[PDB]
Amino acid sequence: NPELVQAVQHVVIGPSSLIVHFNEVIGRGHFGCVYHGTLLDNDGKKIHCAVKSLNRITDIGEVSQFLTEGIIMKDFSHPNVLSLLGICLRSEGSPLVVLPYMKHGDLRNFIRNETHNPTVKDLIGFGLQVAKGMKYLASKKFVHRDLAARNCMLDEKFTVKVADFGLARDMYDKEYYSVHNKTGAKLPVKWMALESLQTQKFTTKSDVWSFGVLLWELMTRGAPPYPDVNTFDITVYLLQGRRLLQPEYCPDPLYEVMLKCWHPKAEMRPSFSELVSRISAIFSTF
Ligand SMILES: Cc1[nH]c(/C=C2\C(=O)Nc3ccc(S(=O)(=O)Cc4c(Cl)cccc4Cl)cc32)c(C)c1C(=O)N1CCC[C@H]1CN1CCCC1
């Protein structure tokens, strides 16, 4: 499609700019592996990067859909939102999606790591970062649909980046995805707002619900949500008004914030602007 090739042209990367280390796999998704790479910016310097292969995709139509949906990310720019470096086009072999390198990986493993032992304050700071990244996306009217600790990365300066959207979205670990929902597709049902499970629709408000689960993940340092609720039962569980319990080391006012995030009435849940304020307030008390 022309329109699409137009926009991709904006972010095209010439192969001689890009070195991929195919011996260096940093993740496997349904579309293909992600590799270590190094990119050369025009005015000099080596940029370490993550290179996503789309070689698994067979249908050209699947690729058009994917670029189409994902390309708008090039318009985003915010220190708490993952950026697109560019797209490399080639002869044999699919386009490579070029993304920033995240030295410290995903937030969930980072905080589960026992030698890291992040403090409650560190944990709340990470949460505040994610809040600010979501505030930006909502203002662009972009709905994430899969916010969670496993989908936020940390760079070498320990800046948190909301990720796994757009050209970076793929199934990377299916443990916490389930087809037991109305669409029949693998969805993150234990992060989904009640109404999305019922109506199959996603909004910024259900992003807020997910951010609420993400917070609980931080304060438990990466414990799995609802470990004793079957994926068959998560809707009924929530209808009954039951919710994730307060973590041992979660401050009380932060648990309030979580609970506001899981209000059954979608419009009764705070905005990310609200969240950034409230959570910022709580962070300062530390
Ligand atoms: C070095 C590294 N990088 C990453 C992830 C990303 C990166 O470097 N750039 C990215 C750009 C986008 C995204 S994403 O979130 O949009 C999609 C994605 C990808 Cl590409 C790969 C894995 C998971 C996900 Cl959700 C992730 C990374 C990860 C998960 C790791 C990474 O892998 N790290 C870092 C801490 C120590 C180590 C822990 N690993 C456990 C098994 C081998 C080592």
CSV table of C-alpha atoms and ligand atoms in Angstrom, one decimal:
chain,number,residue,atom,x,y,z
A,1,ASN,CA,0.0,0.0,0.0
A,2,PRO,CA,1.3,3.5,-1.0
A,3,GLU,CA,0.2,5.6,2.0
A,4,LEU,CA,1.9,3.2,4.3
A,5,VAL,CA,5.2,3.0,2.4
A,6,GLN,CA,5.1,6.8,2.5
A,7,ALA,CA,5.1,7.0,6.3
A,8,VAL,CA,7.6,4.1,6.7
A,9,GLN,CA,9.9,6.1,4.4
A,10,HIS,CA,10.0,8.7,7.2
A,11,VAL,CA,11.7,6.2,9.5
A,12,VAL,CA,13.7,4.0,7.1
A,13,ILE,CA,17.1,2.7,8.0
A,14,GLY,CA,19.7,1.7,5.5
A,15,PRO,CA,21.2,-1.8,6.0
A,16,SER,CA,24.7,-0.4,6.0
A,17,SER,CA,23.6,1.6,9.1
A,18,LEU,CA,22.6,-1.6,10.9
A,19,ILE,CA,24.4,-4.6,12.3
A,20,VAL,CA,22.4,-7.5,13.7
A,21,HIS,CA,23.9,-10.1,16.0
A,22,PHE,CA,21.7,-13.1,15.1
A,23,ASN,CA,23.6,-15.1,17.7
A,24,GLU,CA,22.3,-12.7,20.3
A,25,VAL,CA,18.6,-13.4,21.0
A,26,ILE,CA,16.9,-11.2,23.5
A,27,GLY,CA,13.4,-12.4,22.9
A,28,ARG,CA,11.2,-14.6,20.8
A,29,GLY,CA,7.7,-13.4,19.7
A,30,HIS,CA,5.2,-14.9,17.3
A,31,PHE,CA,6.4,-12.6,14.5
A,32,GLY,CA,10.0,-13.6,15.0
A,33,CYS,CA,13.1,-13.1,17.2
A,34,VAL,CA,14.4,-9.9,18.6
A,35,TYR,CA,18.2,-9.5,18.4
A,36,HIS,CA,21.0,-7.4,19.7
A,37,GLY,CA,22.0,-4.8,17.2
A,38,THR,CA,24.1,-1.7,16.7
A,39,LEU,CA,22.8,1.3,14.7
A,40,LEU,CA,25.0,4.1,13.3
A,41,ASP,CA,23.4,7.5,13.6
A,42,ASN,CA,24.2,9.9,10.7
A,43,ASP,CA,26.3,12.2,12.8
A,44,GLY,CA,28.7,9.6,14.1
A,45,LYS,CA,27.9,7.3,17.0
A,46,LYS,CA,27.1,3.6,17.6
A,47,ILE,CA,23.7,3.0,19.0
A,48,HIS,CA,23.0,-0.3,20.7
A,49,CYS,CA,19.5,-1.4,19.8
A,50,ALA,CA,17.0,-4.2,19.8
A,51,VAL,CA,16.1,-5.6,16.3
A,52,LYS,CA,12.7,-7.2,15.8
A,53,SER,CA,12.5,-9.7,12.9
A,54,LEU,CA,9.1,-10.2,11.2
A,55,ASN,CA,10.4,-13.2,9.2
A,56,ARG,CA,7.8,-15.5,10.7
A,57,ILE,CA,4.9,-13.6,9.1
A,58,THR,CA,3.9,-15.3,5.8
A,59,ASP,CA,1.0,-13.2,4.6
A,60,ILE,CA,1.9,-9.9,3.1
A,61,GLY,CA,-1.6,-8.9,4.3
A,62,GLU,CA,-0.7,-9.6,7.9
A,63,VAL,CA,2.4,-7.4,7.5
A,64,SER,CA,0.4,-4.5,6.0
A,65,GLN,CA,-2.0,-4.7,8.9
A,66,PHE,CA,0.8,-4.7,11.4
A,67,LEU,CA,2.7,-1.7,10.0
A,68,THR,CA,-0.6,0.1,9.4
A,69,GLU,CA,-1.6,-0.3,13.1
A,70,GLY,CA,1.8,0.3,14.5
A,71,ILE,CA,3.3,3.1,12.4
A,72,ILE,CA,1.7,5.9,14.4
A,73,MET,CA,4.1,5.3,17.2
A,74,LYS,CA,6.8,7.3,15.3
A,75,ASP,CA,4.7,10.3,16.2
A,76,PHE,CA,5.0,9.7,19.9
A,77,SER,CA,7.8,11.1,22.0
A,78,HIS,CA,8.1,11.0,25.8
A,79,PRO,CA,10.8,9.8,28.2
A,80,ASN,CA,8.4,7.2,29.7
A,81,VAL,CA,7.2,5.9,26.3
A,82,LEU,CA,9.1,3.4,24.1
A,83,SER,CA,10.3,5.1,20.9
A,84,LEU,CA,10.7,3.7,17.4
A,85,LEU,CA,14.3,4.1,16.1
A,86,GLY,CA,13.3,3.1,12.5
A,87,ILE,CA,12.5,0.4,10.0
A,88,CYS,CA,15.1,-1.4,7.9
A,89,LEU,CA,14.1,-2.6,4.4
A,90,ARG,CA,15.9,-5.4,2.6
A,91,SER,CA,15.9,-7.7,-0.4
A,92,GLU,CA,15.2,-11.2,0.9
A,93,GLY,CA,13.9,-11.1,4.4
A,94,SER,CA,11.1,-9.0,5.9
A,95,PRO,CA,11.5,-5.5,7.3
A,96,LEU,CA,13.3,-5.2,10.6
A,97,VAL,CA,11.8,-3.1,13.3
A,98,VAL,CA,14.5,-1.2,15.1
A,99,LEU,CA,13.9,-0.3,18.7
A,100,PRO,CA,15.9,1.2,21.6
A,101,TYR,CA,18.1,-1.2,23.7
A,102,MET,CA,16.8,-1.6,27.2
A,103,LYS,CA,19.8,-2.6,29.3
A,104,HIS,CA,17.8,-3.6,32.4
A,105,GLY,CA,15.0,-5.4,30.7
A,106,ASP,CA,11.4,-5.7,31.8
A,107,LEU,CA,10.2,-4.1,35.1
A,108,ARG,CA,8.7,-7.4,36.4
A,109,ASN,CA,11.9,-9.4,36.3
A,110,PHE,CA,13.8,-6.4,37.6
A,111,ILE,CA,11.8,-6.2,40.8
A,112,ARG,CA,11.6,-9.9,41.3
A,113,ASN,CA,15.4,-10.0,41.2
A,114,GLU,CA,16.5,-10.7,44.8
A,115,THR,CA,19.8,-8.9,44.6
A,116,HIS,CA,18.1,-5.8,43.4
A,117,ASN,CA,15.8,-5.6,46.4
A,118,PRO,CA,14.1,-2.3,45.4
A,119,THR,CA,12.7,-0.3,48.3
A,120,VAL,CA,9.0,0.7,48.6
A,121,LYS,CA,10.1,4.1,47.5
A,122,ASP,CA,11.9,2.8,44.4
A,123,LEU,CA,8.8,0.8,43.6
A,124,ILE,CA,6.5,3.8,43.9
A,125,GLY,CA,8.9,5.8,41.7
A,126,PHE,CA,8.7,3.2,39.0
A,127,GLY,CA,4.9,3.4,39.3
A,128,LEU,CA,5.0,7.1,39.0
A,129,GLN,CA,7.1,6.9,35.8
A,130,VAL,CA,4.6,4.5,34.2
A,131,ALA,CA,1.8,6.8,35.2
A,132,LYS,CA,3.4,9.7,33.4
A,133,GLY,CA,4.0,7.5,30.3
A,134,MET,CA,0.3,6.6,30.3
A,135,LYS,CA,-0.7,10.2,30.8
A,136,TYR,CA,1.1,11.0,27.6
A,137,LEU,CA,-0.5,8.2,25.6
A,138,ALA,CA,-4.0,9.0,26.8
A,139,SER,CA,-3.6,12.6,25.7
A,140,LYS,CA,-2.8,11.3,22.2
A,141,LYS,CA,-6.0,9.2,22.6
A,142,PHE,CA,-3.9,6.0,22.2
A,143,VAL,CA,-5.3,2.9,24.0
A,144,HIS,CA,-2.7,0.4,25.1
A,145,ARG,CA,-4.8,-2.7,25.9
A,146,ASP,CA,-1.9,-4.7,27.5
A,147,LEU,CA,-0.3,-2.5,30.2
A,148,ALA,CA,1.5,-4.7,32.8
A,149,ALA,CA,4.8,-5.0,34.6
A,150,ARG,CA,6.1,-7.5,32.0
A,151,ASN,CA,5.5,-4.9,29.3
A,152,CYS,CA,7.5,-2.0,30.7
A,153,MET,CA,11.2,-1.9,30.2
A,154,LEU,CA,14.1,-0.1,32.0
A,155,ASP,CA,17.0,1.6,30.2
A,156,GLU,CA,20.5,2.1,31.4
A,157,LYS,CA,19.5,5.2,33.4
A,158,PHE,CA,16.7,3.2,35.0
A,159,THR,CA,14.1,5.3,33.2
A,160,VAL,CA,10.9,3.3,32.8
A,161,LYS,CA,9.4,3.0,29.3
A,162,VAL,CA,5.8,1.8,28.6
A,163,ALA,CA,6.3,-0.7,25.7
A,164,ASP,CA,4.8,-3.6,23.9
A,165,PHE,CA,2.6,-1.5,21.7
A,166,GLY,CA,2.6,-0.6,18.0
A,167,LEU,CA,5.4,-2.1,16.0
A,168,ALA,CA,6.8,-3.6,19.2
A,169,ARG,CA,3.6,-5.5,20.1
A,170,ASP,CA,3.8,-9.3,20.0
A,171,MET,CA,3.2,-12.5,22.1
A,172,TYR,CA,6.5,-13.0,23.9
A,173,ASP,CA,5.4,-15.0,26.9
A,174,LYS,CA,2.0,-16.7,26.9
A,175,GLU,CA,1.9,-17.8,30.6
A,176,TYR,CA,-0.4,-14.9,31.5
A,177,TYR,CA,-2.5,-14.9,28.4
A,178,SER,CA,-5.7,-17.0,28.0
A,179,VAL,CA,-8.2,-17.8,25.3
A,180,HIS,CA,-10.9,-18.2,27.9
A,181,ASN,CA,-12.7,-15.0,26.9
A,182,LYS,CA,-15.3,-13.9,24.4
A,183,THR,CA,-12.9,-13.2,21.5
A,184,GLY,CA,-11.3,-16.6,21.6
A,185,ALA,CA,-7.9,-15.0,21.4
A,186,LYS,CA,-5.0,-15.1,23.9
A,187,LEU,CA,-5.8,-12.1,26.1
A,188,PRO,CA,-4.3,-10.9,29.5
A,189,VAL,CA,-7.6,-11.5,31.3
A,190,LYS,CA,-6.2,-11.0,34.8
A,191,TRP,CA,-5.2,-7.4,33.8
A,192,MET,CA,-8.4,-6.6,32.0
A,193,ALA,CA,-11.2,-4.3,33.3
A,194,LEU,CA,-14.4,-6.1,34.0
A,195,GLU,CA,-16.3,-4.3,31.2
A,196,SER,CA,-13.7,-5.3,28.6
A,197,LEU,CA,-14.3,-8.9,29.5
A,198,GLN,CA,-18.0,-8.4,29.1
A,199,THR,CA,-18.2,-6.0,26.1
A,200,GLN,CA,-14.8,-6.9,24.4
A,201,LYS,CA,-14.0,-3.2,24.2
A,202,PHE,CA,-10.9,-1.5,25.4
A,203,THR,CA,-10.6,2.2,26.5
A,204,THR,CA,-8.3,4.4,28.4
A,205,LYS,CA,-10.4,3.7,31.4
A,206,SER,CA,-9.7,0.0,31.2
A,207,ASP,CA,-6.1,1.0,30.8
A,208,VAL,CA,-6.5,2.6,34.2
A,209,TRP,CA,-7.8,-0.7,35.6
A,210,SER,CA,-4.7,-2.4,34.2
A,211,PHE,CA,-2.4,0.3,35.6
A,212,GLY,CA,-4.0,-0.6,38.9
A,213,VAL,CA,-3.0,-4.2,38.6
A,214,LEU,CA,0.4,-3.0,37.6
A,215,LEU,CA,0.7,-1.1,40.8
A,216,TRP,CA,-0.2,-4.2,42.8
A,217,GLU,CA,2.6,-6.0,40.9
A,218,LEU,CA,5.1,-3.3,42.0
A,219,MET,CA,4.2,-3.5,45.7
A,220,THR,CA,4.3,-7.3,45.7
A,221,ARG,CA,7.5,-7.2,43.7
A,222,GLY,CA,6.2,-9.2,40.8
A,223,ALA,CA,3.8,-11.7,42.4
A,224,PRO,CA,1.2,-13.2,40.0
A,225,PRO,CA,-2.3,-11.7,40.3
A,226,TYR,CA,-5.2,-13.9,41.4
A,227,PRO,CA,-3.1,-17.1,41.6
A,228,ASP,CA,-6.1,-19.0,43.0
A,229,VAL,CA,-8.7,-17.7,40.5
A,230,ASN,CA,-9.1,-19.8,37.4
A,231,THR,CA,-9.3,-18.0,34.1
A,232,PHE,CA,-12.8,-19.5,33.8
A,233,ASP,CA,-13.8,-17.4,36.9
A,234,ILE,CA,-12.2,-14.0,36.6
A,235,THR,CA,-15.4,-12.3,35.4
A,236,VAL,CA,-17.6,-13.8,38.1
A,237,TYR,CA,-14.9,-13.0,40.6
A,238,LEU,CA,-14.9,-9.4,39.7
A,239,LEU,CA,-18.7,-9.1,39.3
A,240,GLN,CA,-19.0,-10.1,43.0
A,241,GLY,CA,-16.8,-7.1,43.8
A,242,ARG,CA,-13.8,-9.1,44.9
A,243,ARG,CA,-10.4,-7.4,44.3
A,244,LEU,CA,-6.6,-8.0,44.7
A,245,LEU,CA,-5.8,-7.7,48.4
A,246,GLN,CA,-3.5,-5.1,49.9
A,247,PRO,CA,0.2,-6.1,49.7
A,248,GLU,CA,2.2,-6.4,52.9
A,249,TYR,CA,4.4,-3.4,52.0
A,250,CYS,CA,1.8,-1.3,50.2
A,251,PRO,CA,1.1,2.0,51.9
A,252,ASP,CA,-2.6,2.4,52.7
A,253,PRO,CA,-3.1,5.5,50.5
A,254,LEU,CA,-1.6,3.7,47.6
A,255,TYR,CA,-4.0,0.8,48.0
A,256,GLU,CA,-6.8,3.3,48.0
A,257,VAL,CA,-5.5,4.5,44.6
A,258,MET,CA,-5.5,0.9,43.4
A,259,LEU,CA,-9.1,0.4,44.5
A,260,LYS,CA,-10.2,3.6,42.7
A,261,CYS,CA,-8.6,2.0,39.6
A,262,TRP,CA,-10.9,-1.0,39.8
A,263,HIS,CA,-14.2,0.8,40.3
A,264,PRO,CA,-16.9,-1.2,38.4
A,265,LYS,CA,-18.2,2.1,37.0
A,266,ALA,CA,-15.6,3.0,34.3
A,267,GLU,CA,-16.2,6.8,34.6
A,268,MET,CA,-15.7,6.5,38.3
A,269,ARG,CA,-12.0,5.6,37.9
A,270,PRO,CA,-9.4,8.4,38.0
A,271,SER,CA,-7.6,9.8,34.9
A,272,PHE,CA,-3.9,9.3,34.5
A,273,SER,CA,-3.5,13.0,35.2
A,274,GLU,CA,-5.3,12.3,38.5
A,275,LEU,CA,-3.0,9.3,39.1
A,276,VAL,CA,0.2,11.2,38.3
A,277,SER,CA,-0.9,13.8,40.9
A,278,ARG,CA,-2.0,11.4,43.6
A,279,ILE,CA,1.0,9.1,43.2
A,280,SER,CA,3.4,12.0,43.0
A,281,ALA,CA,1.9,13.3,46.3
A,282,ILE,CA,2.4,9.9,47.9
A,283,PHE,CA,6.0,9.5,46.6
A,284,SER,CA,7.0,12.8,48.2
A,285,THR,CA,6.0,11.6,51.6
A,286,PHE,CA,9.0,9.3,51.1
B,1,LIG,C1,18.9,-7.0,27.6
B,1,LIG,C2,17.4,-7.1,27.6
B,1,LIG,N1,16.6,-6.3,26.8
B,1,LIG,C3,15.3,-6.7,27.0
B,1,LIG,C4,14.1,-6.1,26.3
B,1,LIG,C5,14.1,-5.0,25.4
B,1,LIG,C6,15.2,-4.2,24.8
B,1,LIG,O1,16.4,-4.4,25.0
B,1,LIG,N2,14.7,-3.3,23.9
B,1,LIG,C7,13.3,-3.4,23.8
B,1,LIG,C8,12.4,-2.7,23.0
B,1,LIG,C9,11.0,-3.0,23.2
B,1,LIG,C10,10.5,-4.1,24.0
B,1,LIG,S1,8.8,-4.5,24.1
B,1,LIG,O2,8.4,-4.5,25.5
B,1,LIG,O3,8.1,-3.5,23.3
B,1,LIG,C11,8.6,-6.2,23.4
B,1,LIG,C12,9.4,-7.3,24.1
B,1,LIG,C13,10.6,-7.7,23.5
B,1,LIG,CL1,11.2,-7.0,22.0
B,1,LIG,C14,11.4,-8.7,24.1
B,1,LIG,C15,11.0,-9.4,25.3
B,1,LIG,C16,9.7,-9.0,25.9
B,1,LIG,C17,8.9,-7.9,25.3
B,1,LIG,CL2,7.5,-7.5,26.1
B,1,LIG,C18,11.5,-4.8,24.8
B,1,LIG,C19,12.9,-4.5,24.7
B,1,LIG,C20,15.2,-7.7,27.9
B,1,LIG,C21,14.0,-8.4,28.4
B,1,LIG,C22,16.6,-8.0,28.3
B,1,LIG,C23,17.1,-9.0,29.3
B,1,LIG,O4,16.9,-10.2,29.0
B,1,LIG,N3,17.8,-8.7,30.5
B,1,LIG,C24,18.0,-7.4,31.0
B,1,LIG,C25,18.1,-7.6,32.5
B,1,LIG,C26,18.9,-8.9,32.6
B,1,LIG,C27,18.3,-9.7,31.4
B,1,LIG,C28,17.4,-10.8,31.9
B,1,LIG,N4,17.4,-11.9,30.9
B,1,LIG,C29,16.7,-13.1,31.3
B,1,LIG,C30,17.0,-14.2,30.3
B,1,LIG,C31,18.3,-13.8,29.6
B,1,LIG,C32,18.6,-12.5,30.4
